[PDB]
Enzyme design. Sequence first.
Site, PDB file in Angstrom:
ATOM      1  N   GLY A   1       0.588  -1.069   0.086  1.00 35.48           N
ATOM      2  CA  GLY A   1      -0.199  -0.049  -0.083  1.00 35.48           C
ATOM      3  C   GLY A   1       0.867   1.397   0.019  1.00 35.48           C
ATOM      4  O   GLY A   1       0.332   2.216  -0.815  1.00 35.48           O
ATOM      5  N   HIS A   2       1.630   1.263   0.760  1.00 33.02           N
ATOM      6  CA  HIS A   2       2.754   2.485   0.825  1.00 33.02           C
ATOM      7  C   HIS A   2       3.617   2.750  -0.524  1.00 33.02           C
ATOM      8  O   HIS A   2       3.529   4.068  -0.726  1.00 33.02           O
ATOM      9  CB  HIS A   2       3.898   2.380   2.005  1.00 33.02           C
ATOM     10  CG  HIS A   2       2.912   2.777   3.392  1.00 33.02           C
ATOM     11  ND1 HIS A   2       2.633   1.775   4.256  1.00 33.02           N
ATOM     12  CD2 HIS A   2       2.485   4.146   3.687  1.00 33.02           C
ATOM     13  CE1 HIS A   2       1.961   2.300   5.190  1.00 33.02           C
ATOM     14  NE2 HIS A   2       1.661   3.756   5.206  1.00 33.02           N
ATOM     15  N   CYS A   3       3.917   1.693  -1.055  1.00 33.25           N
ATOM     16  CA  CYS A   3       4.476   1.796  -2.455  1.00 33.25           C
ATOM     17  C   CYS A   3       3.399   2.402  -3.493  1.00 33.25           C
ATOM     18  O   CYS A   3       3.663   3.190  -4.315  1.00 33.25           O
ATOM     19  CB  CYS A   3       4.755   0.396  -2.996  1.00 33.25           C
ATOM     20  SG  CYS A   3       6.448  -0.256  -1.729  1.00 33.25           S
TER      21      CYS A   3
END
EC number: 5.3.4.1
Length: 118
Positions: free
Chosen positions: A35-37
Amino acid sequence: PEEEDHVLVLRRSNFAEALAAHRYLLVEFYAPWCGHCRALAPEYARAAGRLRAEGSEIRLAKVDATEESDLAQQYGVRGYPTIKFFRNGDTASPREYTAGREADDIVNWLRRRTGPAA
């Protein structure tokens, strides 16, 4: 080499050549499912577009570490995203990127490493 929205696509077969061609090279090791990517990918690409718009020699690159795992393990990647800045092609001592994830603070951080007109 391949380029997605001005971000160089790197793998083991072209990684050494990118370091030799680009003395200011920011590299994001990522996983497409993370998700953070996902939240980072548009900002990273907007940072690269702005540097390109500014005629900068700084280059942004990305490495899918799930597909290029040996390369990722060579740089001690143990979580995603992991962002490292390589200077003058020196792979022993990359600077770790730990600043904000918006487009403007990536380029600001890069400008502080190099200069306003690098």
